[model samples]
Target chain A: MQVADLKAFSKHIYNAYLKNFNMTKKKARSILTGPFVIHDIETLWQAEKGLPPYKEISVHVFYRCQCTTVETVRELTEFAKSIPSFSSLFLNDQVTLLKYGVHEAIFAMLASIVNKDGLLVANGSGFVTREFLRSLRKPFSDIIEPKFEFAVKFNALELDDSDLALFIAAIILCGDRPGLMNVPRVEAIQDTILRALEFHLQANHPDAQYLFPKLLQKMADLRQLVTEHAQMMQRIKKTETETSLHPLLQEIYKD
Target chain B: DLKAFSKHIYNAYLKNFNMTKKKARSILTPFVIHDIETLWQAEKGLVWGLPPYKEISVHVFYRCQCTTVETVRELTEFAKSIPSFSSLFLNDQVTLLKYGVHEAIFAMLASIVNKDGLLVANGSGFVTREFLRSLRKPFSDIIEPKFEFAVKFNALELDDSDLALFIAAIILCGDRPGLMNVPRVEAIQDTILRALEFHLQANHPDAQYLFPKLLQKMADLRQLVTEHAQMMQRIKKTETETSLHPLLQEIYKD
Candidate 1:
């Protein structure tokens, strides 16, 4: 992870976890933005020369909360899972709107998990886009679940519809993913999700009052699906294990 | 019988000379060609069979074999050792080195030894003037002895002595099998010391000056080895210090 990405995420955590509810936006922005001196910090704590700093400060800042950052992420996962529909509708709508404020944070967390798990799984950005479409083939149907197959096909449709393919060559080969946190893709995906959310929210439903909560659940389920892919990829990294379709595959697949 | 022996000698000479020429052309990749008769006649007076001449052949064979075997051995060993050792351990070492690995150091050292060995073994034996010039400071008075021996006994050629020294130095420094062979070390050390004494007495001007220096260096090296053995003993005395000893213990511990 690069320093810039770390700084971005750290800034996010500072706002989300440390800031008071009543703090003015202008004041919060001013407080969080600076102490902007660049310093090299080791990628791994054990590294001798460490890593070169483009932006991340080597200094450690502590919040009063007893729970570790990792523990907080775990809590967030549980919170996401507990909600009905798992925030899918919310995420889908967030993607559509493109106003990806908190969405980048969620993507950064998911991306870290994907990197840990290897390439078989993707971040939300990876899910919403056609980056991993190349992994799909005829053999994949027998190996992977039907939901993933649908997801893959859904992505293929998107790929076919837009100028995305024209730029795909450059994106695949030369696109430098700048920063420790990949929030741009997150921002793009969230915009798409928001658009989906807006459409679903405006439509008449038997449970219209339960809109945001249900939408949040849908978002959670989508994230869970990607996480399952990440888990399978993790196993594949160490050995030649057969891959399986995710549990949510039934939701996406008609059969 | 003389004619038969001569025929066998002629065949051996042609075979050895042709092999050397092939190696030279292969390694150097020079396109220049000269008449075969001119080359044959120019080298006709060279001895067909001598121990020193044969030593050149042995040195070259061993050097080539060592290079190929070492490459294959190290690569396979590294591949196997990586998973067995764990990425954590390797990463720790990489981190310790500030991201640049010790593998690079080892590879550079191996390249240097291989280059030096090839240059010495393939190009010329002890008769090469380049070898003599390298030792000029210590053996300045040996010019007369070197010239006399080169004319009377081509085996005594300064370049041949240099090649011998080069081979011995490589065996000592390059972690070769012969250096690890206890019995072979004893045999070679006696033979080499005797040769060194003879050369120093006859021709080396700085014999009085350099002999003590050489002896002290040898003694210091031996002492260092002895100290290392004792250090291992001391370490082992303290809780057996992991599975580094008794290869089976290491595997079993893991």
Candidate 2:
């Protein structure tokens, strides 16, 4: 009897997805009457440089990139809350899920803006080049290169934004995070999310086969990705980077 | 009897391709293609071969076999009938026909199709769209896509009179594989397109922008044919007991 509820569960989650993501509204806004994005912050300057706006100038750019990253995480947070039964958890359980899962969720969304030539940064104003990006010193260098490979490979799946909504939900609502106010509750949501993901794939990509289990393996790849990611952040925070990391990020790394 | 170049092509379309509006004297015309609701009403489908129509599997299976073989011959004859196509380099003739026939079949497949169903056994019989939908997975997957293509195709309100040049426009494409004389093939292709557009001018002059619109639909068939070829490969493997006709096996290369 409970099995019949899967379709309804999938429908409910996806409608919440449309409400929470900065998608079609932003997409519609971009093309209609042209209120802008990448160029939204008009203060950005052109790099008419002889390598002088070099790695030393990297801080403001990396920090701006981080600021953008932090904004995305806040969206991830609300999307997590939008998951049914998630808000009902013990409040600490909520933070635990967010803290542990947000990086994975962030990088899952990362695949959308990227295809190895770095990604659009400062909104769509500049398609930041991976070449010059690595020309800066090691900290910014570290993340882009690893992601260049992961994000490029991830795109071969041809996953669109709708799949990523359910994908990111599964990452955030994971039951296996190292704490518990409710292990079974998180597990319950995680199971339903995977089943919904399977049902969604069957309808959404009828041409595809073995895509659901194939995506489960992506969770493994994301696990390793966030571990390496946290490793870099610890090095920067432990020493000096001149740019203070954002607090949401700092709280994430506080563990 | 005023005639432009398209006039000649229209006559070839009638003379070469099967134009059905009859019954199952031809298999699939109507007597054979059945719904799940109707298929069981037949008597004891076994013992192989027709008239007895006893073995349901045997009868329908042979229909696909005959339909496929006949369609290939008809397409070849139509391609050869095109102006300058018959005069092309001999080896090159077969390659263009080989590569382009599937698109031609489907492009013309629109003629027999309506939104809910297709006529079979010449024009004598029809199978409902719903019965075809009820088939198993891999087969079911192909139905709506083909039906969908024909529906949009029919929306242009073309008749067989229009299709002759359109189907000719589809078959002589210089882009097909195995061409040494691309410039020659291209020259012939351009003539057909000219004839095709002019036909639309005289025949469908009141219709808006159909020449370009029709070109887009033909362009759309590349993806459809690519996917169909891929699925055709899987059925040969998965349903190992079955086989596409021998020349068709040649048509569906790895």
Candidate 3:
């Protein structure tokens, strides 16, 4: 079929993806609030100190972060595969794109789980305050701050799940990944996703003329956030010998 | 001390390029054609196969690449001029430059782009907004936001000293992926940020929020580079006939 026909088909497919990958802020808040109750600083400290060993608190916190990262990556991968164009890519190219692009995508999705106050943690059972996040140890704390900072601003754009699905597709199909085998093919896919995004935004938010560019800017913010995250991870890996990345998380960062 | 050093870097930028926007605009306005078609006809006589618009795209890419390479060298020198940067490990320095240069270059591009268009080749010529917009889909879209950001950023009225420290801050950023010594890089950036804040306070004493505004602009610059890299990737893939300079390719490859 023609390019136009393919794009139109892709649009429907994207809708299906959005419907299936449903991680709306409303849904996220409901999932996060039930178990991830926010404790005041003093209460949190007392509870943590009450635990048998201090190491368990830190380890539990680290474990929580790792679980969240892995879950987020898995969802993001399924989201990426849902895009017809992404699945069409060579298996190696798909891995490469996901390898470099997942962190950026995760940060983008983090906006849904976040608010002006803080982000949801501990499997959506605990809401971590921004102040409490800062109070965590170095490197570990550094990881969340930049994401929160980006998520707050990104949330300001007020894109819904439809807009976000397309945006996430654009991020995943990025042509700039190092070691991409089929740059032109990947670029073509990205271009189609971008066009679909622009068109979708027009229909979704008619008065918001600036949303497309704003979303583009958010992608850049996510890039910078991931860079900082990587640096923080590097510091953790080097200095905090006790903290180890899950094998999957380790592979994501290793590249 | 910061003023002298910043001025030196600014002068180095000026010495490298004979064309400034004012000079280029003066030379270009007399010959400026309003339409992309006429301009294309004038530049290349015949436009076929790729279209005149694509021809201009190639020209703009080369011009941008040339400026980027020269600016990168100047940035390297400016970084070396800072004692803290020179003190970093050689590998660390390379890592910093590799990740940081594109962000820094896009930040600097603001000085050249106005609402109307951007000055190219040291003000030797101007590329009009209309002309840029007339190009093919992705190429056309790649540059408009940068012009938008640059126009807003230029409103800050920062001088060479402010920019030197700002560029230093951009280059010495600790957040660049793959840094070996995060603490060392972080320490240098802290010093630069402190110096930048102090200089902005003294220099733009009457201006409110200039320091914070500059910090935000760095974030804006990161976004611009991300877009720029995406655009370059498109070019490399779609425009097979167009050859990117090795250095430019290297910068974008990773």
Top of the candidates by TM-score: 3
How do the candidates rank by TM-score, highest first? 3, 2, 1
Of candidates 3 and 1, the better by TM-score: 3
Give per-residue CA lDDT, model 1, range B129-246, as digits (tens): 3333333221323222323322332222222222233222222221211111123233344444444445445455643554444445344433443443344344345423221223
Sort by DockQ, top down from the best? 3, 2, 1
Model 1 chain A poorest 10 in a row by lDDT: A58-67
lDDT of 3 by residue, B1-254 (tens): 65565555556545543443345435544233336565655455422112234466676666566667877787777677665677665656887887898787776777666677766534434567878787776667776877787778878866655776787788888776544345667777887788788787788888998888887888878877887777778878888887777877777677
TM-scores for chain A over all candidates: 0.23, 0.85, 0.85
DockQ of each: 0.00, 0.01, 0.01
Clashing pairs in 3: A32-A124, A35-A125, A36-A125, A36-A126, A36-A127, B19-B122
**TM-score of model 1 relative to the true fold?**
0.16
Of candidate 2 chain A, the 10-residue stretch with the lowest lDDT total is: A35-44
Ranking by lDDT: 3, 2, 1
Model 3 interface CAPRI class: incorrect
lDDT string, candidate 3, A96-145, tens digits:
99999988887788889888777766446457777777767665676767
Per-residue lDDT of candidate 2, residues A114-191 (tens digit): 645456553444455566667657776786688777877877888766677788888988999997677886787787
RMSD of each: 28.2, 19.2, 22.6
